Structure 1
Amino acid sequence: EEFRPEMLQGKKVIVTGASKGIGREMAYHLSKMGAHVVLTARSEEGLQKVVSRCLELGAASAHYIAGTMEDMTFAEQFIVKAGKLMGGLDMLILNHITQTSLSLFHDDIHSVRRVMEVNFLSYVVMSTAALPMLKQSNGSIAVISSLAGKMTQPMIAPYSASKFALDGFFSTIRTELYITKVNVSITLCVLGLIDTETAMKEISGIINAQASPKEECALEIIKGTALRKSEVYYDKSPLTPILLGNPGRKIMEFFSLRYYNKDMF
C-alpha cells in the first residue's frame, strides 16, 4: 500500500490546534489535496488567516470555530458543529496542547491538572463525540504525540504524563475497535523535535538537538493516518522508530488477548 494525494480528495477533516505550527501545516496540505476542513484553536484572528489560505490552496471547503479545549462542553459541541458543517467526518486530527514551558518540576498541581485536562481529557471527549460519524465513514483518528510520550526526558513531566496517557488510552481503544470489528483506525503520531517557532523558543538555552521541517512532518502524519497505520514516527534519527517501537510490548499484547472470554466482544 502506497500513498496517493487522491485519498484525501473530498474527505471531511477536522484539525485542532490549526492556528499555527504542525496544525496549520496540516491544514495547508489537506487543502492542497482538495479536502473539506474545519479548524479550531483559541484565536479567531489566527484561524481566519489560515482558513483564507486554505481555499487559496485548493481546499474543497474551509471553516473555523474558535474556542478553548479547557472547556469540555466546547470540545464536545465543537465536534458536532464541525460534523454538521461538512455533513459528516472522515478524519479527526487531535493536535492541540496547552502552553508548556521547560522546567524541573517543583509543585504547581493546578498546572498538572490543566495539562491533563487539555492534553488528555479533551482528546477522549472529542474522540468519543466523533466516533459515531467516524463509524459511518470508516474514518480515522490521528493522535499527535511525541518522543516524550514513549520515553522520558527531564523538565517536561506534566506534558510527558499527558502524552503517555494518550498512548495508554488510545492503544486500548484501537484494539477494542478492532476486536469488535469496527473499521475505524487510530494512528498515534510520535514526533521528534519540529522547527515550530513555539518549540524553538521553548528549548532555547536548554536543548541542543536539531529540529525537523514542520512541513514534511505535517505530510507524514497525513500519509500514515490515511494509510491507517497504528503508529507513525517522525524524527531526524532513523534509529528512533526502532529504539522506541517496543517489539516486546507487541508480543505481550498479542498473547494477552488469548486470556479474554471471546464472548465479551
Structure 2
Amino acid sequence: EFRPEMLQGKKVIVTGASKGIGREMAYHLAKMGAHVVVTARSKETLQKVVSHCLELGAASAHYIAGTMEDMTFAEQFVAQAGKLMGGLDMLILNHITNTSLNLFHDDIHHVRKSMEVNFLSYVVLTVAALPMLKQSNGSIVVVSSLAGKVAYPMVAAYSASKFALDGFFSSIRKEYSVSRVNVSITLCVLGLIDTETAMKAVSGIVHMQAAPKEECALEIIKGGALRQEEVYYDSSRWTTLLIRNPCRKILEELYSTSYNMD
C-alpha cells in the first residue's frame, strides 16, 4: 500500500517534465517533499516548472535543459543532477520525440529518431544512474504505452520503441534478480491521457476516452515507490482485465531454471 511520505526527501530525476505527465509527476513529487531535477529542451517552461514545484513544497528543485538526441548530454545530465542532490533514489524516464498519427510509408528518419530518443537515451540514462541507484537501492521508472504491449496502426515507429523498452528493461530486471542488484524496474503501460500534445495529435482520428494526467502521474509514482514490476493505467476497465500476460510470467519462470551464472 502506497504512502505519500515514501517520497519525502527522496532524490528523483524526471525526464520530459516541461509539460504533460512529466510536469504533473514533478508537481506530485514536490507536494510529497521530494528533491527533484527536471529536464527537457526548452529553457523557459523548465524554469516555470521549477518555480511551481518550489511553491508546492519541494525539498529542492532544479532543471538542466537539453536534447535527448545527444547521448553525451544524457550521460552528463545524470552526473550533474546527482551532484546537486548528492545521490539518486528514483529515475523517471518519461520523454519521447514528437510523434503524430500517420501510416508508415518511407519515414526511416522518424523510425531511427524514435529508437534514439524513446529507447536508446533511456538505456544511456540507466547506465549513468546505476552506480547511484545501487548505493540507495533505488528505482527505475519506464513510462511506456498500451502500444508497447499490443499492436495499433498509425504509430509503427512509436510502437517499436515502446516494445524495445519492454524487451530491454524486463531482461535486465531478470539480470538484477540473479546478480542481487537491489534496483527495481517499473514499466508503466498507459492508455490515452488528456495532455495538450495527445489531444491535438488524436483529434479527429481516434476519439477514445482520455484519462486524467494528474491521476496518471500519481499512479506512475505509486508503482515506482511500491517497486511494482508493471503499472497499468487506462480509462477502459476491459483493458485492465485483458492486458496482463500470465502465460509470459509462467514461461519466464520455466526458463529461469535452465540457466547457470554460477
TM interval, short-chain normalised? over 0.9
Matches within 5 A, 1:99-248: 99-248=98-247
Deviations 1:35-84 (A, max 9, x none): 00000001010000010000100000000000000000000101000000
1-structure distance, mates of 2:259, 2:223: 30
Q: Which amino acid aligns with 1:236?
A: S
Deviation at 1:242, TM superposition (A): 3.1
Identity level (%): 79
SS at match of 1:194: coil
Deviations 1:112-167 (A, max 9, x none): 10110000100000011100000000000100000000001100000000000000
Q: Which amino acid aligns with 1:85?
A: L
Structure 2 unmatched runs, 5+: none
**Aligned position for 1:8:** 7
Number of matched pairs: 262
2-structure distance, mates of 1:30, 1:239: 30
**Aligned position for 1:52:** 51
2-structure distance, mates of 1:67, 1:262: 39
2-structure distance, mates of 1:57, 1:85: 20
SS at match of 1:103: coil
Structure 1 unmatched runs, 5+: none
1-structure distance, mates of 2:108, 2:186: 30
Name the Cα RMSD after superposition: 0.7
Matches within 5 A, 1:246-265: 246-263=245-262
Deviations 1:221-253 (A, max 9, x none): 000100000000000122323312111111100
**Aligned position for 2:63:** 64
2-structure distance, mates of 1:79, 1:115: 21
1-structure distance, mates of 2:227, 2:213: 21
SS at match of 2:44: helix
Deviations 1:95-120 (A, max 9, x none): 00000010000101111101100001
1-structure distance, mates of 2:240, 2:122: 24
Q: Which amino acid aligns with 2:237?
A: P
Deviations 1:173-230 (A, max 9, x none): 1111111111110000000100001001001110110100000000000001000000
Q: Which amino acid aligns with 1:253?
A: E
SS at match of 1:44: coil
Which runs of at least 4 in structure 1 moved beyond 3 Å after TM superposition? none
TM-score, normalised by the number of residues in structure 1:
0.98
Q: Which amino acid aligns with 1:140?
A: S
Deviation at 1:262, TM superposition (A): 4.1
2-structure distance, mates of 1:242, 1:163: 21
TM-score, normalised by the number of residues in structure 2:
0.99
